[PDB]
Design a protein around this ligand. Structure first.
Ligand code: HEM
Ligand code: HEM
Ligand code: HEM
Ligand code: HEM
Lengths: 306, 306, 306, 307, 306, 305
């Protein structure tokens, strides 16, 4: 049984997202860190167990994988596909490595980030750094409960982890990241009932709208994908609010894990390109993607044996 | 009799520091907010009780006071005095309003900050915004325990709150803010023993160094001041670590409360200018001040009666 | 000097409200319990200290007072004044003794109520029993945050505690209770915005509506009362949700404490009978009062010295 | 691989038990809700994770099963059997649906119960609604620690979940419910030592009485049952205290889960009908059963795959 | 106003009792420590806040006082008075210094003890060291809730703190320590009903026996002292269970704080010598005192100003 | 089979109880062993939320022959005394081990009282240690202790006996050692020197890089690779203990392993050294005063007895 990384972690209150590119000649330094990352996570985390719940998930990009490793590639590993929709665009931005650091405390995240980046000084260039925070009762920046319909247990494992379809990379996963900025002024201009029609759920109670009320262009409608056998195709999401009040930045940092990127990409396509029934996802009228990257997060045992 | 602001608050793990200048013609919008700031604190904070622990302390600058309030000034209110030492400099930077927001969770701080800043939009320009976090066991970015010798109870009340010396402003207090950036590379180049001689306390156990071992240019020695009376002059500090791993910013946000700014100014002079036996505070060899402002934090009832 | 009961208690998540009438010839049994009530509280409470936060407030009705005691009475102690509005009616129902039992857990409330009723058995007839519970983020059954504008600290003390206006009963207070049942079906028929106009505050954020938007017949407008001297007249409220799903019973148990009943009664009159601007309180269109009683809660020392 | 309901729940300090009968012509509305119950649980409970620990276990009665479904029946599903002993009797009362709602706080229980009943209005009639609360030291209303000898971990899973003996309903369980009211006057009239002889355990320390001093008519003795092979027969119990002080109601709401009702029913028999060495369970001298119903609690996927 | 030591502390679950005598020529070392004890408390306690709840109360005996300090003595300071009763004896044992260390965790206590004894090494001889632990439900070694009738708030302050009757030592207190060893075998041979008659309270529910049911030789009866004033004479107690399973030692470490030792001494006389109504305290038939010492615990600033 | 609570969540308090069985006290002991699990529940259940009470019961090699008939655990033998050039690992008598853990010491004590109450007059106590962990998981030497313990499935394969000895599957081997520290000598060292002794940074608990990590550091000598090339792991639960009056500052070491071979190898490397290292530098500040090996059977084994 291959040990996965802490993809299927419990709910945490704080996150740091770290996206870097690998400078030329930096390959060796990166490789050294990769084999040490698990022990660094344990070194920082153990001090404050068991309420710390510190984890780090390391992701490697498509272009970077070719620079770092020879031999087999994960079947689904490719650069993020840019989506030029009629109205909305899903941009692809550079990213070689992803560090998805989560804890119940921000300091634990920052300490681990410090350690990781300290080792990576002069080998990487930082592309993006986001410090996320749980907002109230699991609500996002739009004021809706965010995470409700995430799969749990065996359903989560089946949706997230690579299996026998790519046996060399079993216990791995695929992560899609996008940084979204919200137009809060426009959003708070809508009535609650109008916002509900945008999301597809009720605001306070988080009850899903009935199928006869739920618009075809609501976020919930478009991100609902049925598979070839009638089964729901699921992803695991850990959206984190971030922001700066002075610069008027109110954002959602989207991260979605799946066993194949094709599930996540189908959702993206429906959202940005639209379908026959829906011009595009209404949430995009209040949200702008400013980054977009795809990573493969290998099994933990892959990282150690380098 | 006069009800003070929550200067003497319980220990909080998160904080937002918000410094703004008042734009020309923005005075009425500011005055309006100041009368509602307490009810915004309750509106955001109440639903998170009792462990939310949300509080906001509002401070007003010297120049800002004259623009806003026609009437008597607090006796100790003046612009931050710039200190130009032989080696180190304490800069004075713009700042009309200070919002010191604390809570057990960052989201509480962010929500209130949004509300305040939403009301002030178009009337203020942001000068500084810092998101602070408690780091492990009350440690600062230098890895030392921070806040040990803070006064408590009545001793704290007596050292912080304006009394009969300025009866029109009883229940008020004076806040000095400075944003410090650390040279962590140089700092981690010192042995622990050398670091302890810089601070004046043991690193791990936080036990004060013996009188005959403690250096004169150590932080503890230079920030220890006895008044003409013979008793210790004390301030209330709530230093918060902050920073960004990508941009390699590791900082301390200093805020000190005192019933008269004279106390805080004496400490600063001792630090930056030095004494007979000490050129300057050794902590300054590893810390650069980038901001510097002084604010009067009125009694709560002063703010409500506008 | 006179020690009050735990009227100004921290916020608790559980409550038991117990209203009984004294049976003929039951006066002696009642007096014995009253002298012992404080010690029963300690006996039950201490086991679960310090997070138990168990307290009991004992109130005595007007008619009950004249049966139990001789000599001087509290100045404002009268039976509940029935209000006959054109539309809405505030009923008065029998109640001699009030037991207001609060704790962070229901078991502590139940164990104390059991000890009290065990000692009173054969002397009292139960009129009303309500088991109350905190509902989410301090929300009531209407979905609004309840308790935001309660006075705190010294302001709460001045609003609640009898002082020099009635020196023989200093440290006492007056409690008004009303059991309200809500018409949830009608309530949920309104949009959120329409509900906000009924209450006078924003639903999710609990921000008070601007004065130029807040309707004259909103709950907040009608319960805001100023005295001749311009100061706000305040009560301490500790409403608790209750109900049963099978009976479609969704209620608010109202309890308001004030130094004089005149304050509570004024608010109650503006709600039920209306003003020049407003016919009645809109909240009553969705709330029916089914009980109504007034009690005096004496100083703790009055109860002991008996 | 079967996905069970949250029968094996962590320790929770609040519960709502809701027992309803299905009105004539209410089958379709009930069918729709059963399909949505897990999503209603998430809607209410997610916002209060992880400390909320909100779960709902849905049970279906024997008579109700035939009205709702057309396929196979669970092997051990039948109406609650009345036990008519010489002194004490275990009554059978009506119940088509059971909602066993648990959380760390009552508010989450009440919210979910509101959502469920909101959808079922005009299709069902409530028979029983009990709001349970944790009482101090995991004690019941008799003042004894309650739940000490519950199976845990793997032993619990084996005693509770249906397996290959009924493969189509694997992941399911059987729930027996009884509402007991206590005679607290008579009970507190006993000495502690005398109460300990009734239960079979020490009151304050909760240590089990030795085999030599433990009476044959004690609760622990009569509810201890060995199989033919000699292994202990176990049930999972999550009794909740409840009551009203003014009405003098001091109660234990009993709920027992087992992979087969035979186990639970054997215990009931020994309690009410007695043995050769014991007339009846001594606890019944201070406890009256006021309700009695049997339900099958299906695997969660059975409820989902109902459209 | 003088600052007292943390004699009135929110009760904790762990304690170390440390009693030492001062060796020849050890006065100087002791004086050095006493002036540092408060800062040692913060050094060990601060970074563990707010959960640690670490405090140290330092007591000084009658003989020790005259070796350490010149000038006035506390009015009530004298050696522990031996009580040679007809059946039971209250022994006196040597002790110059008392350290009463409390926290929520034993490790916090041990760390402070280590620091104190580290500084006192070679100047003192240890007489007693006790590691104390409360049961989860505030029960003592006898299985009874212990601490129920301790005074709280202002009543506690008035009973424990030295006031105007001895103005120079205001804010001080008197501590009496006794280590008791229990005969558990004998105690557990009693039925609960019999044990209740020994104590004077119900075992399970901690309800006090009624006045006419409570035996006169019960613990609660004999330790209930009414002064010529008419009001109750109270002490603050913090009994801590201790023991060794292997050595069959099951003990209660008694410590009682009062503004004058006469209060404690009167109760102690009643327990050991009895009254006209009762031969002795019934608890003593199951409890043997093996140590006895009296200490003055001065105000914090008294120690600081050395 | 059902294992004992060897794989426990982290607890801040512990009592270690080591006793020998007096002559003729075998039957009394057997009776306890069958009830010990139910005593654990009895004391623990009422505090079930946060109690985290558990008891691990171990039996020594000599005691096993006295108590049982027939099959012995393959790896069960008396603790090997190691007499090194400088440092000595002593063997001390021990028949039964009670490893009791909880979030609070009162719970440990309550259980310990029940067990010893029934064992009274049948056993002699050899050792009784009341353990407390520092709030930041630090040991008596001021270093974070437990960082590199295996978790999850890795911990199961390292600790629990499996198919290699099927009759005793679910069992484990515990080695206990009571260490007393020379604190004065320890606090004489600089932080940097202390780090060279341990093999990890003191504050941040980051392992020293392989270029700087000394060969005689604790982490170096206790890092063992088997023939497979895989790392040989044990589960440790070191507890600080002591007395400020007696100047006792100690670590009570306990190590669980699938086979005692792994623990004994680490122990050899520490006391006897390698080619690169004379001995473990931690021993220059730590003296072993007890040493005993026990087999901790599956819970079922004790029940059906
Ligand atoms: C613009 C930023 C976004 C926000 C604020 C957002 C917020 C939400 C909210 C409030 C829900 C409903 C509650 C829940 O189940 O979590 C939801 C559902 C969901 N979102 Fe998003 N979302 C965002 C972007 C995305 C993206 C980019 C994807 C994938 C490409 C995605 C996939 C989903 C899925 C699969 C669901 C569950 C739908 C279902 O009920 O089956 N979201 N999101
Ligand atoms: C460069 C950023 C600074 C850092 C990292 C820092 C850190 C510390 C530390 C570690 C201590 C010892 C522990 C404690 O008692 O809190 C301390 C003490 C103190 N600091 Fe600072 N400090 C800084 C700047 C300042 C400034 C600007 C002032 C006032 C002008 C100040 C005033 C004090 C005082 C009064 C004490 C207590 C000294 C005593 O009486 O023992 N510090 N600081
Ligand atoms: C009248 C209400 C009842 C009360 C107050 C009650 C209370 C208790 C108590 C205090 C215990 C001992 C502690 C424990 O292990 O939980 C216990 C044990 C038990 N009860 Fe009950 N009980 C009741 C009814 C029932 C019923 C109706 C059944 C089954 C049909 C049952 C089955 C059991 C079982 C199986 C045990 C464990 C016995 C053992 O193996 O040690 N109880 N009960
Ligand atoms: C042998 C060790 C002792 C034990 C186990 C013990 C235990 C108890 C218990 C269970 C109570 C009742 C609950 C409470 O209010 O705390 C109590 C009350 C009390 N004890 Fe003790 N006690 C001991 C020694 C002492 C001594 C030596 C004194 C006096 C010097 C003392 C003074 C008191 C007082 C004043 C009360 C409160 C009486 C009242 O209800 O007003 N105790 N003790």
């Amino acid at each position: 049984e291959p040990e996965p990384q802490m993809v299927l972690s419990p709910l945490t209150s704080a996150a740091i997202f770290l996206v870097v590119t690998i400078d030329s000649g930096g390959e060796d330094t990166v490789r050294d860190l990769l084999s040490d990352v698990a022990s660094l996570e344990r070194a920082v985390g153990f001090r404050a167990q068991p309420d710390g719940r510190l984890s780090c998930v390391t992701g490697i990009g498509s272009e970077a994988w070719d620079r770092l490793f020879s031999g087999a590639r994960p079947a689904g590993l490719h650069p993020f596909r840019e989506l030029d929709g009629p109205v909305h665009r899903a941009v692809a931005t550079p990213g070689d490595l992803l560090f998805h650091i989560r804890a119940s405390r921000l300091d634990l995240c920052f300490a681990l980030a410090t350690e990781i980046m300290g080792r990576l000084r002069g080998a990487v260039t930082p592309q993006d750094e986001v410090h996320g925070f749980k907002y109230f009762d699991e609500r996002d920046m739009l004021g809706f409960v965010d995470g409700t319909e995430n799969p749990t247990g065996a359903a989560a494992r089946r949706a997230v982890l690579v299996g026998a379809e790519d046996p060399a990379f079993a216990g791995g996963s695929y992560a899609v990241v996008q940084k979204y900025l919200h137009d809060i002024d426009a959003w708070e201009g809508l009535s609650v009932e109008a916002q509900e029609r945008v999301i597809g759920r009720r605001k306070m109670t988080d009850v899903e709208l009935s199928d006869d009320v739920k618009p075809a262009d609501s976020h919930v409608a478009l991100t609902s994908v049925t598979g070839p056998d009638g089964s729901d195709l699921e992803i695991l999401r850990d959206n984190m609010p971030f922001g700066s009040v002075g610069r008027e930045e109110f954002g959602t940092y989207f991260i979605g894990y799946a066993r194949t990127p094709e599930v996540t990409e189908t959702m993206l396509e429906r959202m940005f390109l639209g379908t026959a029934s829906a011009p595009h996802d209404r949430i995009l009228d209040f949200s702008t993607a400013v980054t977009g990257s795809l990573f493969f997060t290998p099994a933990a045992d892959f990282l150690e044996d380098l």
